[PDB]
A paper describes a structure:
NS1 of an influenza virus is a multifunctional virulence factor that antagonizes the host’s innate immune response and is associated with many strain-specific functions in viral replication and host range. Especially, many mutations occur in the effector domain (ED) of NS1 that interacts with a number of host factors, including retinoic acid-inducible gene 1 (RIG-I), tripartite motif containing 25 (TRIM25), and phosphoinositide 3-kinase (PI3K), during the infection cycle. Although functionally near-neutral, strain-specific NS1 mutations exhibit long-range epistatic interactions with residues at the p85β-binding interface.
To reveal the mechanistic bases of long-range epistasis and how strain-specific mutations reshaped the energy landscape of NS1 during evolution, we first examined the structure of the NS1:p85β complexes. The structure of the NS1:p85β complex was available for 1918 and PR8 NS1s23,35, and we determined a new crystal structure of VN NS1 bound to p85β in this study. The analysis of slow-exchanging residues on the NMR timescale revealed that the population of the BC-like conformer was ~99% for PR8 and VN NS1s and ~90% for 1918 NS1. This trend reversed between 1972 and 2004, with large negative epistasis.
Residue numbers in the entry:
A (entry chain B): 81 to 199
B (entry chain D): 433 to 499, 521 to 597
C (entry chain A): 81 to 206
D (entry chain C): 433 to 495, 532 to 597
Write the structure that this text describes.
């Protein structure tokens, strides 16, 4: 079927956040920001995205949260630029995960991401 | 100026989309509460008519154990009234089931537009956030 | 559920077209370009768009052609702005058709357009 | 030097997307041909088995055992080939969503480039004419 799944609320999506050491990549039309100042932390990825045919189709927004609740990373579609495919998001998520792991951070994803996006 | 006017216009359109989603979800909540209420009523009526079925099964077993005057003829009339009341209760039960199905129809006719509005609202919010709109301006556009 | 219809070809979508009297309006995040220098013509609307739940969801591109193939109108999502809803596309089709009929033009929509998001009734015959 | 740079990057991305589409399309067509071919082969084998056990059973109502082993091997062949054909079906079933999404995304990138001032020659240049 088709279902638009959401892990984050309006506040988590609109929340302001800061990067002391901002590292940014641009995969296709997807921007992957992360704070390289985060080391030895437990971080969880939360994503709002659409699904068709039990497959990830379009990412609305993904954000990384510490156990306390501070946003230290983000995967977002770039404004004023064309869309993307499911494989683009699948690769961007792995990019962010590797960037967090290099800083000795263990990364976990929600039950929603693990069913349609995996690692 | 131009580039700021466009951001403000996209914020206004986000406000429009968010209010539309609020209205649609309000309507859907109304219909869902009505659906749950009528489903509970249908379950109650099912239990009642099932008790009726049990009693009339006793009636079958006790009517086959006879094979005059008025020792039995006085019962076999009010008990036919009870049969008629059972079938009338079911005539109400199925009539309510039809309305419940129509409510389900109306809700499933809303689900597509509801999901589309929610997704496009979140997308406009993400766009404005990427254009440098702080959380205070986003909440201004949303309303609260 | 969930399909992607295309009335136009790659050449038709990528083809260049010129407006003698440009009339560009904006419906939502959709841009409606139209050559109001067109008059007394029969125009067909051909569109590529995705559908879900047998309803129009996302418009990829709509264009308007004369009988000889020339382009006279277009409805397209703006590049710098986010997406749109099906009602936005219906409104855009309505705006384009009304503006076109205002110049004695007989607008007709394709069958695929007439299924999901459609407008127009009939014009006389100039 | 900036806007043109973004347009050129989106054009190269359109190149990549068109390549992905026209590669997965070749894959899907290669699999569709094989699906139809193996379908017709198994179709023939079904009626062959029909005739086999038909002659085995009808002419047995009165009273040549290698035909039984022939039917055994034919059943085994059809079973294995049906498994292979079902795997081909499962493989080409999971390409239709990717194909539809790739086609829609390529057309959307085409329209974005068109609105940003890309002529038909530029689009055909990124599309391999």
């Amino acid at each position: 079927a088709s279902r638009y799944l959401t892990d984050m609320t309006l506040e988590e999506m609109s929340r302001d956040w800061f990067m002391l050491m901002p590292k940014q990549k641009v995969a296709g039309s997807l921007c992957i920001k992360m704070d390289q100042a985060i080391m030895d932390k437990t971080i969880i990825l939360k994503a709002n995205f659409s699904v068709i045919f039990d497959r990830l189709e379009t990412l609305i927004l993904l954000r990384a949260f510490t156990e306390e609740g501070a946003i230290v990373g983000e995967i977002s579609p770039l404004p004023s630029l064309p869309g993307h495919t499911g494989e683009d998001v699948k690769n961007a998520i792995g990019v962010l995960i590797g960037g967090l792991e290099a800083n000795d951070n263990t990364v976990r994803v929600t039950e929603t991401i693990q069913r349609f996006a995996w690692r | 100026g131009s580039k700021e006017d466009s951001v403000e216009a996209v914020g206004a359109q986000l406000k429009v989309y968010h209010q539309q989603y609020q209205d649609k979800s309000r309507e859907y909540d109304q219909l869902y509460e009505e659906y749950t209420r009528t489903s509970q009523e249908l379950q109650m009526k099912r239990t009642a008519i099932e008790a009726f079925n049990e009693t009339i099964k006793i009636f079958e077993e006790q009517g086959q154990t006879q094979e005059i005057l008025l020792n039995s003829e006085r019962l076999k009339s009010r008990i036919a009234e009870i049969h008629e009341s059972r079938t009338k209760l079911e005539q109400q039960l199925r009539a309510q089931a039809s309305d419940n199905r129509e409510i389900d129809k109306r809700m499933n006719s809303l689900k597509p537009d509801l999901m589309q509005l929610r997704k496009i609202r979140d997308q406009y919010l993400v766009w404005l956030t990427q254009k440098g709109a702080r959380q205070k301006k986003i909440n201004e556009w949303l309303g609260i």
